[model samples]
Target: APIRVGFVGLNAAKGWAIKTHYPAILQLSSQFQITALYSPKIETSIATIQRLKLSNATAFPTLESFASSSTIDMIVIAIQVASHYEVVMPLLEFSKNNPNLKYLFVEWALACSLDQAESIYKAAAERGVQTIISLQGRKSPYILRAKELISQGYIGDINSIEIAGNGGWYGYERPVKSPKYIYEIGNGVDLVTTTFGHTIDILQYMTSSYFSRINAMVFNNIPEQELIDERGNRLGQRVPKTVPDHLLFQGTLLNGNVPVSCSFKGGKKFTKNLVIDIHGTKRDLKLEGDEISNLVLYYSGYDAGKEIMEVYHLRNYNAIVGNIHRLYQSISDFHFNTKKIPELPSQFVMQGFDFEGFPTLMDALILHRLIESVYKSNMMGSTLNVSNISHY
Candidate 1:
């Protein structure tokens, strides 16, 4: 039977659905069947249900009604950051009542409180509902392949890594909504979780070490705080712009005592870039590009002073071959038709909506969580001494 999946939000104009969610799932064929959708607005929901031509997808006017529907085995939530727990709690109860339902996924927003995030995860586990947190880049082929190479001593015991992430949400444009959540970042959704999360997660994953120490500085460069909306009302009058458009951090890793320096800044109109330099005892490798065609490993010791660079083309494609390959490998392992063994907290959801599915979300989640824990450590002004968060 096809995996019975449901989506909770389809407001493309609102944010995440357009940028990430829809494409990820809609592009995948074998992993899921979008059996249902629930949006608060009936008119929009009805129109979208027809627009996507979701033949088997049922349109429900409310989340409660949709959660109660026997047809749904999993739910993909795309609501506000503040509403996750309220929306997810009922679904957890729904799954508890119905034994076979598998997972709940939340595309996080900047406003997500760590306490709330932790609660949602614990609640899902308590109710036997598998959960997926949307942290996309952790599964990038470049990252996975890099990790493998590092483990095998290809990088010759990484000594330091310097990564520079391209800044802003690519121009910082946004549509207006309820405006309850603050945009000031320190209080509302900011770059820390929105963009920095991915950067931090990727570094932690690639290096296989948590942050020993990190100090950050955020700056508001463009100064759009007093800008006005279409109605001539001041934008800051609605949502105060307090978040930092630039950020920089330095961290110490465990192995070989590698150094990690990262920076995030907005307003650079030049070409997009995500560059990382991995330094080792033997040689140094440089990875560049938009985190897509970016993992270029250049070394001098490999050849002559002429340098050798591997253009990791697989890392650039929309449909990631690495992800597809891993998924197939994982599926084959589960096909023995044997009794299930007790499994730890693991993610088994579809990742990267594409034919080849380049990078898997499972890998990303692990990386993101490590980064999240690291951030928590930083917030506490402490180094990551214990890695207890790795279990989940």
Candidate 2:
């Protein structure tokens, strides 16, 4: 039998959880089963069950009851960032005591605040419960290969690195249907955290280093946006957006005095969708494309330029489902297939990087704290060390 899993925010028709997590799970039918779902208003869960035709699944109306239920061994949480602590905290306690409950898979921006993320991490650790974070890009094969090449000196001695990306939210405008909460900073759905949070995780996963110092500009050129859903068919509200429309950060990597710079924008696609340019003494290797889907890793050396090295043209039109599937498969392998003292998903690192096991929550915590320090640095107009941030 597969691991029985329940989802916290499986939408009735369309959503992040349903569109990605559900399909990702379904693709691995031999490893996992969608056994249950939870919603404050039970109708949503019922609707989701019917929409997805989940005939064997159960529905629960409360978080406590869901955690206490016998239907699931793992819980997949995909609710809003602000709502995570409320649901996760209680479940952590439950998973700690309940033998049946073993794991939790949470969407990124782990929680709304540093204290919140720390609480979840610590509680899960002490309770002896495992956690999986949705920073799945770290597990992508292309990224793993990039890490290997960086170690093999495909790019030779590194001189510097640059990361640039653009996403649809937090820009000069907003769709009227856009939730107003995303515009708030601590809500964690903002440009800096949502975009750069995931961005830096991939960076660190490959390089095996954290930021030593950071100078950040959480700059917002568009202070206000009309909450009109593109067409403005419905009456819309006007509000000031507190989140940054654009972010620029420069810092030194922890190892080798490596200098790194980043520029990310929201709303408009001012630059390539996703770009990671690594400069080295011998050859420069670059990874760029639409997020992770059409990703290409190529090299430019002293003699050659724009030569393709490796690529993963994501089979699915949307890149999310495949990476989620990969992470889920890894989790299944860790829990079931792997033998002897069992290889935990948390124990693996990039091939070249060898050290103590940092694991997912700790890595997530580092990146979240890095984001926290970036905002702090921008606000204080001074460089800040990530290590000084409370729990990092």
Candidate 3:
């Protein structure tokens, strides 16, 4: 028999966990089943159950209400950052009380403070709930290849890394009914947690390690934002912006040798370039893909500004780029498209009950937590040692 699963979240943002990932899981093989759903409001919950075709799924008003139910095998929470702790804690306690019950959390990666990210992860850890923090790039093919190259000495002793992230024009928006806390960053275009969060996770993921220290200053190059509500309405409520719209970080590696630095921007997208560079003793490599031109790689000499790699031809780049692109695309599709129907759904790249090792969702969740820890490390004044923070 398949592993019966249940999911719950706040809403239907196409980019969020609720709309993207949970559905992706259901699209997996008959190995998984969407047996339940929960929403803060009964009306919304009932509507979602119908719209999502969740026959076995039942709507619930609270965590306890759902946890106590016999039909729900696992709980996936996709609420706001502030409410995550409150929502997941009860599920944790319930799983503990019921030895056979297991629980998991799918953290909706909206905007949030560094401290808030850590608190949520710590809380989930305490309750023994496996968490997926919405950091997707760790599973990307480009990233994995980059790690492979580094290991093969293609880059030879990563000496430094620098990043240039584009601005808001690239694609940044807030939903109309989103929680007030969602855009509370004032004028702060903090991308360290969201934009660079995935990139940094890739760095850590590829190396099979973590950074030792990070000294970062997030710069809000654009200190002003046209005040708007969740729906892009002009609220005339000007929010003060003081956080860094641009961020730069320098750190030492846990390997006790490599030197690294990274920079990310949030306000107004860059018209010229969005890139990543890694400098090693033997070669310098770069990634030129953006959110749209994603996963392309090229090679250049050591002095290459952002030109880190030296691929001889487009075919070479294509060989590498194609795989990474598909990998991330599959993951994204899985996040949004996978749903175990009464019958098998269409064949897809990232859809399946398992990926890499554990159930697909479970594997992704681990990477998400790892990325959150990296963000937590950056926020704590770049405190490199995360032994005290890795939990649950």
Top candidate when judged by TM-score against the true structure: 2
Q: Write the per-residue lDDT of candidate 3 for residues 1-392, one digit (tens) a residue.
A: 44456666634433355545554565553645667667667777788677767677777676676776667555666665556556655665655554434445354342244444455545555655434334445444556566677778776777776766654521233333434343445211235555565556566665555666556655555555555565567665434444346666666666644667666656434363466777767777666563423333344447535555344223334423343334434433433454422343322222112233112233333334544555455466555554333223
Candidate 1, residues 7-67, lDDT tens digits: the string is 8777545555644556655555455677888877777766776777778888886667788
What is model 1's C-alpha RMSD?
Answer: 6.0
Model 1 worst lDDT run, 10 consecutive residues: 352-361
| Residue-wise C-alpha lDDT for candidate 2, range 226-297, written one tens digit per residue | 565667443455678878888899998877778999998876334558888888786666777675554455
lDDT of model 2, residue 100? 78
lDDT leader: 2
> Candidate 2: misplaced stretches above 4 Å?
227-238, 268-271, 294-317, 338-359, 387-392
- Where does candidate 1 stray beyond 4 Å? 11-20, 109-111, 169-182, 186-188, 219-239, 268-272, 301-306, 314-316, 319-392
Clashes of each: 6, 3, 36
Superposed Cα RMSD, model 2: 3.8
- Estimate the TM-score of every prediction: 0.75, 0.87, 0.67
Worst 10-residue lDDT window for candidate 2 reads 349-358
Relative to the true structure, candidate 2 reaches a TM of: 0.87
